[PDB]
Amino acid sequence: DSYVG
Amino acid sequence: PPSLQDAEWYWGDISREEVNEKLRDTPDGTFLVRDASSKIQGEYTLTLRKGGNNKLIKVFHRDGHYGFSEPLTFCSVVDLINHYRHESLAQYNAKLDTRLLYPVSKY
């Protein structure tokens, strides 16, 4: 989701 | 060595709604760490304010080390956070070009 890779 | 439980920016089991309230209207570099939604021991999530948004960064944990991506080089969550108080996260991702500047303190 709003996780940054 | 200072423990994670005693870190001012570690909030444990709080929801995204609660995080978003604490980060509303805050400047870039405002940050806190909470338990990851998995609710598995040793799994944590950094939330970092950048560009008016709340960026979620998984803290990986393997072989007694922590980090945002392989290789994992830090011996504790506290050491990881204190490192990025003084280095931009742009190395991890170019859209995260800020240091960890302003802890959201529980104290």
PDB file of N, CA and C in Angstrom:
ATOM      1  N   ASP A   1       0.830  -1.198   0.000  1.00  0.00           N
ATOM      2  CA  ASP A   1       0.000   0.000   0.000  1.00  0.00           C
ATOM      3  C   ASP A   1       0.868   1.253   0.000  1.00  0.00           C
ATOM      4  N   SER A   2       0.808   2.014   1.091  1.00  0.00           N
ATOM      5  CA  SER A   2       1.623   3.217   1.241  1.00  0.00           C
ATOM      6  C   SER A   2       3.047   2.890   1.692  1.00  0.00           C
ATOM      7  N   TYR A   3       3.412   1.612   1.594  1.00  0.00           N
ATOM      8  CA  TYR A   3       4.791   1.186   1.825  1.00  0.00           C
ATOM      9  C   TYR A   3       5.704   1.603   0.676  1.00  0.00           C
ATOM     10  N   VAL A   4       6.870   2.130   1.036  1.00  0.00           N
ATOM     11  CA  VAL A   4       7.888   2.529   0.074  1.00  0.00           C
ATOM     12  C   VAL A   4       8.924   1.423  -0.105  1.00  0.00           C
ATOM     13  N   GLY A   5       9.131   0.997  -1.345  1.00  0.00           N
ATOM     14  CA  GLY A   5      10.110  -0.037  -1.633  1.00  0.00           C
ATOM     15  C   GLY A   5      11.534   0.479  -1.741  1.00  0.00           C
TER      16      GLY A   5
ATOM     17  N   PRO B   1      23.180  -0.227  26.683  1.00  0.00           N
ATOM     18  CA  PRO B   1      22.593   0.279  25.439  1.00  0.00           C
ATOM     19  C   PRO B   1      21.104   0.609  25.569  1.00  0.00           C
ATOM     20  N   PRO B   2      20.700   1.775  25.066  1.00  0.00           N
ATOM     21  CA  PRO B   2      19.286   2.168  25.141  1.00  0.00           C
ATOM     22  C   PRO B   2      18.386   1.195  24.387  1.00  0.00           C
ATOM     23  N   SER B   3      17.286   0.808  25.028  1.00  0.00           N
ATOM     24  CA  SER B   3      16.357  -0.164  24.470  1.00  0.00           C
ATOM     25  C   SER B   3      15.313   0.514  23.586  1.00  0.00           C
ATOM     26  N   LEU B   4      14.678  -0.295  22.739  1.00  0.00           N
ATOM     27  CA  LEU B   4      13.632   0.232  21.874  1.00  0.00           C
ATOM     28  C   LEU B   4      12.433   0.704  22.687  1.00  0.00           C
ATOM     29  N   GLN B   5      12.066  -0.049  23.730  1.00  0.00           N
ATOM     30  CA  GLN B   5      10.952   0.350  24.580  1.00  0.00           C
ATOM     31  C   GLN B   5      11.138   1.749  25.149  1.00  0.00           C
ATOM     32  N   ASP B   6      12.377   2.153  25.408  1.00  0.00           N
ATOM     33  CA  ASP B   6      12.661   3.444  26.018  1.00  0.00           C
ATOM     34  C   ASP B   6      12.868   4.563  25.002  1.00  0.00           C
ATOM     35  N   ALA B   7      12.813   4.269  23.706  1.00  0.00           N
ATOM     36  CA  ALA B   7      13.018   5.310  22.708  1.00  0.00           C
ATOM     37  C   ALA B   7      11.784   6.201  22.610  1.00  0.00           C
ATOM     38  N   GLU B   8      12.017   7.517  22.553  1.00  0.00           N
ATOM     39  CA  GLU B   8      10.902   8.461  22.612  1.00  0.00           C
ATOM     40  C   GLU B   8      10.006   8.341  21.392  1.00  0.00           C
ATOM     41  N   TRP B   9      10.556   7.881  20.279  1.00  0.00           N
ATOM     42  CA  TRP B   9       9.844   7.801  19.009  1.00  0.00           C
ATOM     43  C   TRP B   9       9.205   6.439  18.766  1.00  0.00           C
ATOM     44  N   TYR B  10       9.306   5.498  19.708  1.00  0.00           N
ATOM     45  CA  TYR B  10       8.720   4.173  19.547  1.00  0.00           C
ATOM     46  C   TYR B  10       7.384   4.113  20.284  1.00  0.00           C
ATOM     47  N   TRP B  11       6.297   3.898  19.537  1.00  0.00           N
ATOM     48  CA  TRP B  11       4.945   3.996  20.073  1.00  0.00           C
ATOM     49  C   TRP B  11       4.251   2.650  20.218  1.00  0.00           C
ATOM     50  N   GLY B  12       4.899   1.560  19.829  1.00  0.00           N
ATOM     51  CA  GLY B  12       4.294   0.248  20.033  1.00  0.00           C
ATOM     52  C   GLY B  12       3.045   0.052  19.192  1.00  0.00           C
ATOM     53  N   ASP B  13       1.965  -0.379  19.849  1.00  0.00           N
ATOM     54  CA  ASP B  13       0.742  -0.780  19.151  1.00  0.00           C
ATOM     55  C   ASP B  13      -0.186   0.424  19.042  1.00  0.00           C
ATOM     56  N   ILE B  14       0.035   1.224  18.003  1.00  0.00           N
ATOM     57  CA  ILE B  14      -0.862   2.316  17.641  1.00  0.00           C
ATOM     58  C   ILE B  14      -1.302   2.140  16.195  1.00  0.00           C
ATOM     59  N   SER B  15      -2.483   2.660  15.878  1.00  0.00           N
ATOM     60  CA  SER B  15      -3.053   2.469  14.552  1.00  0.00           C
ATOM     61  C   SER B  15      -2.551   3.527  13.572  1.00  0.00           C
ATOM     62  N   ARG B  16      -2.775   3.269  12.277  1.00  0.00           N
ATOM     63  CA  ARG B  16      -2.445   4.269  11.263  1.00  0.00           C
ATOM     64  C   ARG B  16      -3.228   5.554  11.492  1.00  0.00           C
ATOM     65  N   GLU B  17      -4.494   5.438  11.902  1.00  0.00           N
ATOM     66  CA  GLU B  17      -5.286   6.629  12.196  1.00  0.00           C
ATOM     67  C   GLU B  17      -4.612   7.485  13.265  1.00  0.00           C
ATOM     68  N   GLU B  18      -4.104   6.846  14.328  1.00  0.00           N
ATOM     69  CA  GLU B  18      -3.387   7.559  15.385  1.00  0.00           C
ATOM     70  C   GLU B  18      -2.090   8.178  14.870  1.00  0.00           C
ATOM     71  N   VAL B  19      -1.325   7.428  14.073  1.00  0.00           N
ATOM     72  CA  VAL B  19      -0.119   7.979  13.450  1.00  0.00           C
ATOM     73  C   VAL B  19      -0.469   9.199  12.607  1.00  0.00           C
ATOM     74  N   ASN B  20      -1.522   9.091  11.787  1.00  0.00           N
ATOM     75  CA  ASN B  20      -1.845  10.196  10.888  1.00  0.00           C
ATOM     76  C   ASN B  20      -2.228  11.449  11.672  1.00  0.00           C
ATOM     77  N   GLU B  21      -2.891  11.279  12.812  1.00  0.00           N
ATOM     78  CA  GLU B  21      -3.187  12.425  13.661  1.00  0.00           C
ATOM     79  C   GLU B  21      -1.908  13.084  14.167  1.00  0.00           C
ATOM     80  N   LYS B  22      -0.928  12.281  14.593  1.00  0.00           N
ATOM     81  CA  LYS B  22       0.315  12.846  15.112  1.00  0.00           C
ATOM     82  C   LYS B  22       1.149  13.511  14.024  1.00  0.00           C
ATOM     83  N   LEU B  23       1.048  13.042  12.776  1.00  0.00           N
ATOM     84  CA  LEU B  23       1.843  13.608  11.690  1.00  0.00           C
ATOM     85  C   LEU B  23       1.124  14.700  10.908  1.00  0.00           C
ATOM     86  N   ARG B  24      -0.157  14.949  11.191  1.00  0.00           N
ATOM     87  CA  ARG B  24      -0.882  15.972  10.450  1.00  0.00           C
ATOM     88  C   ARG B  24      -0.196  17.327  10.586  1.00  0.00           C
ATOM     89  N   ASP B  25       0.026  17.983   9.450  1.00  0.00           N
ATOM     90  CA  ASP B  25       0.591  19.327   9.385  1.00  0.00           C
ATOM     91  C   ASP B  25       2.037  19.416   9.870  1.00  0.00           C
ATOM     92  N   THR B  26       2.757  18.283   9.984  1.00  0.00           N
ATOM     93  CA  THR B  26       4.134  18.327  10.469  1.00  0.00           C
ATOM     94  C   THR B  26       5.126  18.478   9.318  1.00  0.00           C
ATOM     95  N   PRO B  27       6.316  19.016   9.593  1.00  0.00           N
ATOM     96  CA  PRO B  27       7.314  19.199   8.536  1.00  0.00           C
ATOM     97  C   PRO B  27       7.988  17.896   8.131  1.00  0.00           C
ATOM     98  N   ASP B  28       8.596  17.939   6.943  1.00  0.00           N
ATOM     99  CA  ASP B  28       9.375  16.816   6.446  1.00  0.00           C
ATOM    100  C   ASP B  28      10.425  16.415   7.477  1.00  0.00           C
ATOM    101  N   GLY B  29      10.598  15.107   7.655  1.00  0.00           N
ATOM    102  CA  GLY B  29      11.544  14.595   8.623  1.00  0.00           C
ATOM    103  C   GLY B  29      10.946  14.265   9.974  1.00  0.00           C
ATOM    104  N   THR B  30       9.677  14.607  10.203  1.00  0.00           N
ATOM    105  CA  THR B  30       8.964  14.116  11.377  1.00  0.00           C
ATOM    106  C   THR B  30       8.768  12.607  11.253  1.00  0.00           C
ATOM    107  N   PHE B  31       8.918  11.879  12.364  1.00  0.00           N
ATOM    108  CA  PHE B  31       8.930  10.426  12.251  1.00  0.00           C
ATOM    109  C   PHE B  31       8.549   9.764  13.572  1.00  0.00           C
ATOM    110  N   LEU B  32       8.088   8.522  13.447  1.00  0.00           N
ATOM    111  CA  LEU B  32       7.912   7.628  14.583  1.00  0.00           C
ATOM    112  C   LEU B  32       8.001   6.189  14.091  1.00  0.00           C
ATOM    113  N   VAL B  33       8.163   5.271  15.034  1.00  0.00           N
ATOM    114  CA  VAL B  33       8.176   3.840  14.764  1.00  0.00           C
ATOM    115  C   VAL B  33       7.059   3.190  15.568  1.00  0.00           C
ATOM    116  N   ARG B  34       6.315   2.294  14.925  1.00  0.00           N
ATOM    117  CA  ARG B  34       5.286   1.525  15.597  1.00  0.00           C
ATOM    118  C   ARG B  34       5.489   0.049  15.276  1.00  0.00           C
ATOM    119  N   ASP B  35       4.756  -0.804  15.990  1.00  0.00           N
ATOM    120  CA  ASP B  35       4.749  -2.222  15.657  1.00  0.00           C
ATOM    121  C   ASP B  35       4.129  -2.430  14.280  1.00  0.00           C
ATOM    122  N   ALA B  36       4.668  -3.396  13.541  1.00  0.00           N
ATOM    123  CA  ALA B  36       4.137  -3.714  12.222  1.00  0.00           C
ATOM    124  C   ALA B  36       2.766  -4.367  12.346  1.00  0.00           C
ATOM    125  N   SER B  37       1.941  -4.176  11.313  1.00  0.00           N
ATOM    126  CA  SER B  37       0.573  -4.694  11.347  1.00  0.00           C
ATOM    127  C   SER B  37       0.537  -6.213  11.497  1.00  0.00           C
ATOM    128  N   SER B  38       1.583  -6.909  11.046  1.00  0.00           N
ATOM    129  CA  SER B  38       1.654  -8.356  11.227  1.00  0.00           C
ATOM    130  C   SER B  38       1.526  -8.769  12.688  1.00  0.00           C
ATOM    131  N   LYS B  39       1.890  -7.888  13.621  1.00  0.00           N
ATOM    132  CA  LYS B  39       1.864  -8.181  15.056  1.00  0.00           C
ATOM    133  C   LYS B  39       2.779  -9.347  15.423  1.00  0.00           C
ATOM    134  N   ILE B  40       3.837  -9.523  14.649  1.00  0.00           N
ATOM    135  CA  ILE B  40       4.866 -10.519  14.908  1.00  0.00           C
ATOM    136  C   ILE B  40       5.989  -9.846  15.682  1.00  0.00           C
ATOM    137  N   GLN B  41       6.499 -10.530  16.706  1.00  0.00           N
ATOM    138  CA  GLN B  41       7.565  -9.968  17.527  1.00  0.00           C
ATOM    139  C   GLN B  41       8.776  -9.630  16.667  1.00  0.00           C
ATOM    140  N   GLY B  42       9.349  -8.451  16.901  1.00  0.00           N
ATOM    141  CA  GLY B  42      10.504  -8.008  16.151  1.00  0.00           C
ATOM    142  C   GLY B  42      10.207  -7.345  14.823  1.00  0.00           C
ATOM    143  N   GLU B  43       8.933  -7.145  14.480  1.00  0.00           N
ATOM    144  CA  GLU B  43       8.521  -6.541  13.216  1.00  0.00           C
ATOM    145  C   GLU B  43       8.007  -5.130  13.484  1.00  0.00           C
ATOM    146  N   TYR B  44       8.646  -4.142  12.864  1.00  0.00           N
ATOM    147  CA  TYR B  44       8.346  -2.745  13.128  1.00  0.00           C
ATOM    148  C   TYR B  44       8.210  -1.993  11.815  1.00  0.00           C
ATOM    149  N   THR B  45       7.545  -0.840  11.891  1.00  0.00           N
ATOM    150  CA  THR B  45       7.284   0.004  10.733  1.00  0.00           C
ATOM    151  C   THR B  45       7.665   1.435  11.073  1.00  0.00           C
ATOM    152  N   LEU B  46       8.547   2.019  10.267  1.00  0.00           N
ATOM    153  CA  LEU B  46       8.868   3.429  10.377  1.00  0.00           C
ATOM    154  C   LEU B  46       7.868   4.228   9.551  1.00  0.00           C
ATOM    155  N   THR B  47       7.331   5.291  10.135  1.00  0.00           N
ATOM    156  CA  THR B  47       6.510   6.246   9.394  1.00  0.00           C
ATOM    157  C   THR B  47       7.262   7.567   9.350  1.00  0.00           C
ATOM    158  N   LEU B  48       7.493   8.076   8.138  1.00  0.00           N
ATOM    159  CA  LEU B  48       8.288   9.275   7.903  1.00  0.00           C
ATOM    160  C   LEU B  48       7.461  10.292   7.133  1.00  0.00           C
ATOM    161  N   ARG B  49       7.430  11.516   7.635  1.00  0.00           N
ATOM    162  CA  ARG B  49       6.778  12.616   6.944  1.00  0.00           C
ATOM    163  C   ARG B  49       7.654  13.116   5.798  1.00  0.00           C
ATOM    164  N   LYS B  50       7.088  13.159   4.593  1.00  0.00           N
ATOM    165  CA  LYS B  50       7.808  13.671   3.428  1.00  0.00           C
ATOM    166  C   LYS B  50       6.787  14.196   2.428  1.00  0.00           C
ATOM    167  N   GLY B  51       6.937  15.460   2.033  1.00  0.00           N
ATOM    168  CA  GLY B  51       6.053  16.051   1.035  1.00  0.00           C
ATOM    169  C   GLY B  51       4.596  16.117   1.431  1.00  0.00           C
ATOM    170  N   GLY B  52       4.302  16.256   2.723  1.00  0.00           N
ATOM    171  CA  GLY B  52       2.933  16.244   3.192  1.00  0.00           C
ATOM    172  C   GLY B  52       2.292  14.879   3.235  1.00  0.00           C
ATOM    173  N   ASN B  53       3.059  13.819   3.016  1.00  0.00           N
ATOM    174  CA  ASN B  53       2.563  12.456   3.072  1.00  0.00           C
ATOM    175  C   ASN B  53       3.299  11.692   4.162  1.00  0.00           C
ATOM    176  N   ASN B  54       2.699  10.585   4.585  1.00  0.00           N
ATOM    177  CA  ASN B  54       3.253   9.719   5.623  1.00  0.00           C
ATOM    178  C   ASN B  54       3.742   8.440   4.952  1.00  0.00           C
ATOM    179  N   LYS B  55       5.053   8.349   4.750  1.00  0.00           N
ATOM    180  CA  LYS B  55       5.661   7.223   4.054  1.00  0.00           C
ATOM    181  C   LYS B  55       5.915   6.089   5.034  1.00  0.00           C
ATOM    182  N   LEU B  56       5.538   4.880   4.642  1.00  0.00           N
ATOM    183  CA  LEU B  56       5.699   3.698   5.473  1.00  0.00           C
ATOM    184  C   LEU B  56       6.906   2.911   4.985  1.00  0.00           C
ATOM    185  N   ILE B  57       7.807   2.587   5.906  1.00  0.00           N
ATOM    186  CA  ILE B  57       9.038   1.878   5.585  1.00  0.00           C
ATOM    187  C   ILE B  57       9.141   0.680   6.511  1.00  0.00           C
ATOM    188  N   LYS B  58       9.136  -0.517   5.932  1.00  0.00           N
ATOM    189  CA  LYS B  58       9.260  -1.734   6.717  1.00  0.00           C
ATOM    190  C   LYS B  58      10.681  -1.868   7.251  1.00  0.00           C
ATOM    191  N   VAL B  59      10.803  -2.204   8.527  1.00  0.00           N
ATOM    192  CA  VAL B  59      12.096  -2.535   9.118  1.00  0.00           C
ATOM    193  C   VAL B  59      12.235  -4.050   9.064  1.00  0.00           C
ATOM    194  N   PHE B  60      13.138  -4.520   8.208  1.00  0.00           N
ATOM    195  CA  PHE B  60      13.414  -5.942   8.104  1.00  0.00           C
ATOM    196  C   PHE B  60      14.311  -6.391   9.251  1.00  0.00           C
ATOM    197  N   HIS B  61      14.152  -7.652   9.639  1.00  0.00           N
ATOM    198  CA  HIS B  61      14.873  -8.230  10.769  1.00  0.00           C
ATOM    199  C   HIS B  61      15.226  -9.666  10.405  1.00  0.00           C
ATOM    200  N   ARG B  62      16.521  -9.949  10.283  1.00  0.00           N
ATOM    201  CA  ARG B  62      16.985 -11.290   9.961  1.00  0.00           C
ATOM    202  C   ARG B  62      18.398 -11.458  10.499  1.00  0.00           C
ATOM    203  N   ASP B  63      18.651 -12.610  11.121  1.00  0.00           N
ATOM    204  CA  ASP B  63      19.989 -12.975  11.591  1.00  0.00           C
ATOM    205  C   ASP B  63      20.524 -11.972  12.610  1.00  0.00           C
ATOM    206  N   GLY B  64      19.640 -11.495  13.485  1.00  0.00           N
ATOM    207  CA  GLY B  64      20.015 -10.532  14.501  1.00  0.00           C
ATOM    208  C   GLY B  64      20.321  -9.141  13.996  1.00  0.00           C
ATOM    209  N   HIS B  65      20.028  -8.845  12.729  1.00  0.00           N
ATOM    210  CA  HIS B  65      20.282  -7.535  12.151  1.00  0.00           C
ATOM    211  C   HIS B  65      18.988  -6.913  11.643  1.00  0.00           C
ATOM    212  N   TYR B  66      19.034  -5.595  11.459  1.00  0.00           N
ATOM    213  CA  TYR B  66      17.889  -4.811  11.022  1.00  0.00           C
ATOM    214  C   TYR B  66      18.298  -3.889   9.883  1.00  0.00           C
ATOM    215  N   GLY B  67      17.317  -3.507   9.074  1.00  0.00           N
ATOM    216  CA  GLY B  67      17.560  -2.563   8.002  1.00  0.00           C
ATOM    217  C   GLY B  67      16.322  -2.407   7.149  1.00  0.00           C
ATOM    218  N   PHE B  68      16.412  -1.461   6.214  1.00  0.00           N
ATOM    219  CA  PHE B  68      15.338  -1.201   5.263  1.00  0.00           C
ATOM    220  C   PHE B  68      15.413  -2.092   4.030  1.00  0.00           C
ATOM    221  N   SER B  69      16.595  -2.613   3.707  1.00  0.00           N
ATOM    222  CA  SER B  69      16.766  -3.518   2.579  1.00  0.00           C
ATOM    223  C   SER B  69      18.092  -4.241   2.743  1.00  0.00           C
ATOM    224  N   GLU B  70      18.227  -5.349   2.020  1.00  0.00           N
ATOM    225  CA  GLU B  70      19.459  -6.124   2.053  1.00  0.00           C
ATOM    226  C   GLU B  70      20.603  -5.316   1.444  1.00  0.00           C
ATOM    227  N   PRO B  71      21.803  -5.362   2.041  1.00  0.00           N
ATOM    228  CA  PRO B  71      22.086  -6.140   3.252  1.00  0.00           C
ATOM    229  C   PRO B  71      21.650  -5.407   4.519  1.00  0.00           C
ATOM    230  N   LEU B  72      21.250  -6.167   5.534  1.00  0.00           N
ATOM    231  CA  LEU B  72      20.858  -5.614   6.824  1.00  0.00           C
ATOM    232  C   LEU B  72      22.104  -5.475   7.688  1.00  0.00           C
ATOM    233  N   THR B  73      22.412  -4.246   8.103  1.00  0.00           N
ATOM    234  CA  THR B  73      23.694  -3.957   8.733  1.00  0.00           C
ATOM    235  C   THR B  73      23.608  -3.423  10.158  1.00  0.00           C
ATOM    236  N   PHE B  74      22.418  -3.185  10.695  1.00  0.00           N
ATOM    237  CA  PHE B  74      22.299  -2.568  12.007  1.00  0.00           C
ATOM    238  C   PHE B  74      21.976  -3.604  13.073  1.00  0.00           C
ATOM    239  N   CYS B  75      22.523  -3.398  14.269  1.00  0.00           N
ATOM    240  CA  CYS B  75      22.352  -4.348  15.355  1.00  0.00           C
ATOM    241  C   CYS B  75      21.080  -4.128  16.159  1.00  0.00           C
ATOM    242  N   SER B  76      20.397  -3.003  15.967  1.00  0.00           N
ATOM    243  CA  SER B  76      19.166  -2.724  16.692  1.00  0.00           C
ATOM    244  C   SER B  76      18.356  -1.724  15.882  1.00  0.00           C
ATOM    245  N   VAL B  77      17.061  -1.664  16.193  1.00  0.00           N
ATOM    246  CA  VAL B  77      16.204  -0.632  15.619  1.00  0.00           C
ATOM    247  C   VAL B  77      16.690   0.754  16.031  1.00  0.00           C
ATOM    248  N   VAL B  78      17.103   0.910  17.299  1.00  0.00           N
ATOM    249  CA  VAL B  78      17.622   2.196  17.776  1.00  0.00           C
ATOM    250  C   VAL B  78      18.836   2.645  16.966  1.00  0.00           C
ATOM    251  N   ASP B  79      19.771   1.726  16.686  1.00  0.00           N
ATOM    252  CA  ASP B  79      20.952   2.084  15.902  1.00  0.00           C
ATOM    253  C   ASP B  79      20.568   2.479  14.482  1.00  0.00           C
ATOM    254  N   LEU B  80      19.586   1.776  13.903  1.00  0.00           N
ATOM    255  CA  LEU B  80      19.106   2.109  12.566  1.00  0.00           C
ATOM    256  C   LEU B  80      18.531   3.518  12.539  1.00  0.00           C
ATOM    257  N   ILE B  81      17.644   3.828  13.486  1.00  0.00           N
ATOM    258  CA  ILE B  81      17.046   5.161  13.524  1.00  0.00           C
ATOM    259  C   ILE B  81      18.106   6.231  13.757  1.00  0.00           C
ATOM    260  N   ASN B  82      19.019   6.000  14.707  1.00  0.00           N
ATOM    261  CA  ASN B  82      20.001   7.041  15.005  1.00  0.00           C
ATOM    262  C   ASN B  82      20.925   7.296  13.824  1.00  0.00           C
ATOM    263  N   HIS B  83      21.200   6.261  13.031  1.00  0.00           N
ATOM    264  CA  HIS B  83      21.982   6.462  11.818  1.00  0.00           C
ATOM    265  C   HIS B  83      21.278   7.424  10.870  1.00  0.00           C
ATOM    266  N   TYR B  84      19.975   7.206  10.637  1.00  0.00           N
ATOM    267  CA  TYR B  84      19.261   8.056   9.689  1.00  0.00           C
ATOM    268  C   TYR B  84      18.824   9.399  10.269  1.00  0.00           C
ATOM    269  N   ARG B  85      19.053   9.649  11.564  1.00  0.00           N
ATOM    270  CA  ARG B  85      19.014  11.027  12.032  1.00  0.00           C
ATOM    271  C   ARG B  85      20.088  11.876  11.359  1.00  0.00           C
ATOM    272  N   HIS B  86      21.130  11.244  10.800  1.00  0.00           N
ATOM    273  CA  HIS B  86      22.294  11.967  10.307  1.00  0.00           C
ATOM    274  C   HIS B  86      22.658  11.595   8.882  1.00  0.00           C
ATOM    275  N   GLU B  87      21.798  10.854   8.199  1.00  0.00           N
ATOM    276  CA  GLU B  87      21.978  10.524   6.792  1.00  0.00           C
ATOM    277  C   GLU B  87      20.594  10.475   6.172  1.00  0.00           C
ATOM    278  N   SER B  88      20.474  11.023   4.969  1.00  0.00           N
ATOM    279  CA  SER B  88      19.208  10.980   4.253  1.00  0.00           C
ATOM    280  C   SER B  88      18.819   9.549   3.885  1.00  0.00           C
ATOM    281  N   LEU B  89      17.508   9.302   3.843  1.00  0.00           N
ATOM    282  CA  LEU B  89      17.010   8.027   3.346  1.00  0.00           C
ATOM    283  C   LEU B  89      16.990   7.953   1.826  1.00  0.00           C
ATOM    284  N   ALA B  90      17.509   8.971   1.132  1.00  0.00           N
ATOM    285  CA  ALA B  90      17.533   8.952  -0.328  1.00  0.00           C
ATOM    286  C   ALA B  90      18.297   7.753  -0.873  1.00  0.00           C
ATOM    287  N   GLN B  91      19.292   7.263  -0.133  1.00  0.00           N
ATOM    288  CA  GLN B  91      19.994   6.058  -0.553  1.00  0.00           C
ATOM    289  C   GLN B  91      19.038   4.877  -0.654  1.00  0.00           C
ATOM    290  N   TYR B  92      18.099   4.765   0.291  1.00  0.00           N
ATOM    291  CA  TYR B  92      17.117   3.689   0.223  1.00  0.00           C
ATOM    292  C   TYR B  92      16.112   3.924  -0.898  1.00  0.00           C
ATOM    293  N   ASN B  93      15.667   5.167  -1.079  1.00  0.00           N
ATOM    294  CA  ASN B  93      14.703   5.489  -2.126  1.00  0.00           C
ATOM    295  C   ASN B  93      14.780   6.978  -2.417  1.00  0.00           C
ATOM    296  N   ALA B  94      14.907   7.328  -3.701  1.00  0.00           N
ATOM    297  CA  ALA B  94      15.119   8.717  -4.086  1.00  0.00           C
ATOM    298  C   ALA B  94      13.950   9.619  -3.719  1.00  0.00           C
ATOM    299  N   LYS B  95      12.771   9.053  -3.477  1.00  0.00           N
ATOM    300  CA  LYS B  95      11.615   9.836  -3.064  1.00  0.00           C
ATOM    301  C   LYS B  95      11.594  10.102  -1.565  1.00  0.00           C
ATOM    302  N   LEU B  96      12.595   9.621  -0.828  1.00  0.00           N
ATOM    303  CA  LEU B  96      12.658   9.806   0.618  1.00  0.00           C
ATOM    304  C   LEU B  96      13.878  10.639   0.991  1.00  0.00           C
ATOM    305  N   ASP B  97      14.090  11.757   0.298  1.00  0.00           N
ATOM    306  CA  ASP B  97      15.291  12.564   0.514  1.00  0.00           C
ATOM    307  C   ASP B  97      15.079  13.505   1.695  1.00  0.00           C
ATOM    308  N   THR B  98      15.157  12.926   2.890  1.00  0.00           N
ATOM    309  CA  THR B  98      15.210  13.671   4.142  1.00  0.00           C
ATOM    310  C   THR B  98      15.865  12.784   5.188  1.00  0.00           C
ATOM    311  N   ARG B  99      16.481  13.427   6.177  1.00  0.00           N
ATOM    312  CA  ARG B  99      16.906  12.740   7.385  1.00  0.00           C
ATOM    313  C   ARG B  99      15.725  12.595   8.338  1.00  0.00           C
ATOM    314  N   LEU B 100      15.924  11.780   9.371  1.00  0.00           N
ATOM    315  CA  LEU B 100      14.979  11.655  10.480  1.00  0.00           C
ATOM    316  C   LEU B 100      15.255  12.791  11.458  1.00  0.00           C
ATOM    317  N   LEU B 101      14.492  13.873  11.348  1.00  0.00           N
ATOM    318  CA  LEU B 101      14.820  15.139  11.999  1.00  0.00           C
ATOM    319  C   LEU B 101      14.043  15.404  13.278  1.00  0.00           C
ATOM    320  N   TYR B 102      12.770  15.026  13.334  1.00  0.00           N
ATOM    321  CA  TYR B 102      11.885  15.471  14.409  1.00  0.00           C
ATOM    322  C   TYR B 102      11.104  14.274  14.919  1.00  0.00           C
ATOM    323  N   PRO B 103      11.589  13.615  15.961  1.00  0.00           N
ATOM    324  CA  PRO B 103      10.831  12.494  16.526  1.00  0.00           C
ATOM    325  C   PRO B 103       9.518  12.988  17.101  1.00  0.00           C
ATOM    326  N   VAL B 104       8.469  12.190  16.907  1.00  0.00           N
ATOM    327  CA  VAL B 104       7.214  12.372  17.631  1.00  0.00           C
ATOM    328  C   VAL B 104       7.396  11.686  18.978  1.00  0.00           C
ATOM    329  N   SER B 105       7.548  12.478  20.042  1.00  0.00           N
ATOM    330  CA  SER B 105       7.950  11.931  21.332  1.00  0.00           C
ATOM    331  C   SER B 105       6.757  11.557  22.200  1.00  0.00           C
ATOM    332  N   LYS B 106       6.852  10.393  22.837  1.00  0.00           N
ATOM    333  CA  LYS B 106       5.888   9.961  23.843  1.00  0.00           C
ATOM    334  C   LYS B 106       6.215  10.470  25.246  1.00  0.00           C
ATOM    335  N   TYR B 107       7.296  11.228  25.403  1.00  0.00           N
ATOM    336  CA  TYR B 107       7.730  11.723  26.706  1.00  0.00           C
ATOM    337  C   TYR B 107       7.640  13.245  26.789  1.00  0.00           C
TER     338      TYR B 107
END
